[PDB]
Amino acid sequence: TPAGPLTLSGQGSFFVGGRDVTSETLSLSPKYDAHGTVTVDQMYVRYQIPQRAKRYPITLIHGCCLTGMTWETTPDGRMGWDEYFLRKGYSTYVIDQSGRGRSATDISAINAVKLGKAPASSLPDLFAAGHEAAWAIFRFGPRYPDAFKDTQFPVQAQAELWQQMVPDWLGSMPTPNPTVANLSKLAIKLDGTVLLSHSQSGIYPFQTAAMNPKGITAIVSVEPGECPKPEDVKPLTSIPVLVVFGDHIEEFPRWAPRLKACHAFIDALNAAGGKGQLMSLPALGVHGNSHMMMQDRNNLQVADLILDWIGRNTA
Amino acid sequence: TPAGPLTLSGQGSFFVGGRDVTSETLSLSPKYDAHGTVTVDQMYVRYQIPQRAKRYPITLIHGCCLTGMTWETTPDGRMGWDEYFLRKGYSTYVIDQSGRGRSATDISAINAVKLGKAPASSLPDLFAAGHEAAWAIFRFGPRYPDAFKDTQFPVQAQAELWQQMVPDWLGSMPTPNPTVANLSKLAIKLDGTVLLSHSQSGIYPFQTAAMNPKGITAIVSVEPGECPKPEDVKPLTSIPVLVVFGDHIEEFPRWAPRLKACHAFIDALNAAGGKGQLMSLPALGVHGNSHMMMQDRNNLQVADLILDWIGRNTA
Numbered sequence: 001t002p003a004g005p006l007t008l009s010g011q012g013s014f015f016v017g018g019r020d021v022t023s024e025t026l027s028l029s030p031k032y033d034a035h036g037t038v039t040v041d042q043m044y045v046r047y048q049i050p051q052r053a054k055r056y057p058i059t060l061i062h063g064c065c066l067t068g069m070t071w072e073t074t075p076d077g078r079m080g081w082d083e084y085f086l087r088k089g090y091s092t093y094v095i096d097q098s099g100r101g102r103s104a105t106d107i108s109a110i111n112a113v114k115l116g117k118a119p120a121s122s123l124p125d126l127f128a129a130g131h132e133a134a135w136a137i138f139r140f141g142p143r144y145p146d147a148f149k150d151t152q153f154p155v156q157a158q159a160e161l162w163q164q165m166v167p168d169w170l171g172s173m174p175t176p177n178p179t180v181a182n183l184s185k186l187a188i189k190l191d192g193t194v195l196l197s198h199s200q201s202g203i204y205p206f207q208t209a210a211m212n213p214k215g216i217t218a219i220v221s222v223e224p225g226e227c228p229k230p231e232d233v234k235p236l237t238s239i240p241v242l243v244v245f246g247d248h249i250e251e252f253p254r255w256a257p258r259l260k261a262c263h264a265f266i267d268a269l270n271a272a273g274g275k276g277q278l279m280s281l282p283a284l285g286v287h288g289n290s291h292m293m294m295q296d297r298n299n300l301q302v303a304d305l306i307l308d309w310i311g312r313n314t315a
Numbered sequence: 316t317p318a319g320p321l322t323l324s325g326q327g328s329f330f331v332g333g334r335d336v337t338s339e340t341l342s343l344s345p346k347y348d349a350h351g352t353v354t355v356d357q358m359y360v361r362y363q364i365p366q367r368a369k370r371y372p373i374t375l376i377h378g379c380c381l382t383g384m385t386w387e388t389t390p391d392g393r394m395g396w397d398e399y400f401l402r403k404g405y406s407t408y409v410i411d412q413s414g415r416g417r418s419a420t421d422i423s424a425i426n427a428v429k430l431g432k433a434p435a436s437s438l439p440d441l442f443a444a445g446h447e448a449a450w451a452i453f454r455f456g457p458r459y460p461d462a463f464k465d466t467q468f469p470v471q472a473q474a475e476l477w478q479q480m481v482p483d484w485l486g487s488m489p490t491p492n493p494t495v496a497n498l499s500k501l502a503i504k505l506d507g508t509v510l511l512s513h514s515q516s517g518i519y520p521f522q523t524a525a526m527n528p529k530g531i532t533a534i535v536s537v538e539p540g541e542c543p544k545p546e547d548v549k550p551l552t553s554i555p556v557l558v559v560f561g562d563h564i565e566e567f568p569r570w571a572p573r574l575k576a577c578h579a580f581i582d583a584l585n586a587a588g589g590k591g592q593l594m595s596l597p598a599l600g601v602h603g604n605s606h607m608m609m610q611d612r613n614n615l616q617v618a619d620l621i622l623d624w625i626g627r628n629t630a
């Protein structure tokens with residue numbers, strides 16, 4: 001944990017993309033006009049630039065049920081990857097996905113239903129993760145609230161983890177998510193960035209690269225919900241890819257086939273003349289990591305492994 | 316404008332408050348369990364600590380239809396108050412209100428209706444500000460898209476301002492807003508903070524202080540939607556109060572009575588033995604400021620006026 005002060009050459013915030021929508025259900029009060037134009041699908045980006053920044057920034061992309069908070073102070077109060085990457089001399093761009101956190105949703109259809117201007121079927125598909133289900137999906141232990149004896153997650157700060165979990169609007173937006181096109185715009189503007197994503201967003205950087213490879217220096221995908229199909233690897237052959245998996249995988253039916261499918265993806269990518277690696281942490285002698293490995297007690301060691309791979313693959 | 320790098324003694328993020336809710340409608344899907352517990356009403360807080368930080372941090376509290384992005388890089392890419400306060404030696408705590416931005420809402424009621432289990436009238440009360448209506452409320456000009464000739468707002472970056480506007484769930488939360496109790500918990504934990512709020516949240520610090528004055532060093536309220544009533548000043552007489560108004564007020568029926576009512580508040584506060592000041596920017600020879608004065612082209616001059624008062628009233 002590099003202690004002491006942190007010096008920033010630059011910092012700021014901006015949005016990427018967005019579309020203007022005409023609505024007639026913005027308000028339910030006669031005090032406000034229900035007719036107007038709003039901007040939706042834009043992506044919030046917060047950036048920090050260290051002194052003597054390395055050539056390529058890292059863009060950090062959270063998964064479901066969470067925001068860019070994912071990468072900030074861990075639930076138990078320790079340094080997160082955002083601060084760590086900065087201290088290691090990488091410029092960092094931390095997003096909130098379209099329709100999440102500080103990135104605006106459209107509430108038009110909800111108010112439409114409440115006003116009678118649309119049927120209940122127009123209501124968006126929404127999801128929030130309960131503590132009990134999250135426990136098992138995160139692989140903290142076999143069932144809530146029992147932890148694996150060797151878990152790296154600070155389970156004593158479980159209440160704080162729950163504080164950072166939010167409703168997810170993914171199901172009410174297209175596939176690919178508008179985040180995908182926004183990530184292409186960001187990478188082009190930056191003229192080269194490493195895209196580092198997680199879980200729900202694990203597939204995003206591959207989808208972005210398939211849309212337009214420009215500006216995508218490398219991909220790091222942490223325990224993705226899905227990897228690209230073996231037959232889809234051709235457009236990816238020029239971009240170094242790292243897929244990272246933690247521990248206690250085989251005991252979970254949700255996770256075991258994903259690791260298997262990701263191995264198949266990496267193998268096919270490499271067979272096609274590409275450059276992929278499946279980093280399994282237990283195979284490297286690093287044990288106990290949860291799905292929330294960026295927040296685990298050895299999160300900086302996990303960061304080092306990833307950063308070493310980035311350094312060797314962006315030279 | 317202060318140039319060059321910025322050094323931080325520390326930075327991080329955490330949440331304040333929250334309550335657990337058991338819901339039967341967290342999901343619409345047969346895959347994911349619709350029954351579970353979520354945490355709602357927690358308040359996101361991002362802090363930065365400069366070297367040799369002043370004794371009292373400033374807590375920045377956004378208004379409606381917006382998030383803590385309010386105080387970050389302006390829409391046209393210039394330094395915001397958050398960075399500026401840091402450079403002037405103040406620790407800053409920038410929040411997302413409960414139920415806004417990175418602070419979780421409960422989507423249970425929306426899913427219940429989509430599942431046919433509850434009627435459309437049970438849907439939450441949601442609002443979004445249209446560009447055209449916001450233009451007039453912000454006082455950029457009389458009606459969209461005509462700008463006052465002397466406006467301090469960077470109207471050329473209106474598109475970027477629209478990107479940072481988001482749906483507002485205030486109507487579906489209790490009163491006082493859960494943000495109020497969370498600001499007390501924050502102020503007490505910090506053992507003294509200046510609360511600086513805006514518009515919708517203009518009243519929040521006063522409600523907080525009347526609830527519990529502990530840790531509230533001073534209040535700065537920027538163009539509040541309401542000031543306390545003259546008869547309600549007695550819990551506030553030991554806390555220095557600044558209320559700030561910009562320009563082009565009298566031509567707007569929304570705004571003219573709020574200035575007048577805030578004058579009555581301040582006069583009665585002083586008369587009850589308190590310490591209040593209504594800072595009217597045009598009365599100080601500062602012209603053209605909009606409702607979004609923290610984003611205006613002279614935003615650092617406005618900050619200087621505010622910081623001068625803070626310095627003199629916290630010594």
Ligand SMILES: CN1Cc2ccccc2N[C@@H](CC(=O)O)C1=O
Pocket residue numbers: 063064065066129133134137138198199200201225291
């Ligand atoms: C961050 N995260 C973990 C997660 C936690 C709780 C509920 C779902 C869920 N889904 C995953 C995605 C998936 O496994 O398909 C996710 O994105």
Ligand SMILES: CN1Cc2ccccc2N[C@@H](CC(=O)O)C1=O
Pocket residue numbers: 378379380381444448449452453513514515516540606
């Ligand atoms: C940030 N902001 C300005 C605003 C802009 C657009 C719509 C409403 C609205 N309400 C105000 C509150 C009010 O005037 O009662 C607000 O918070």
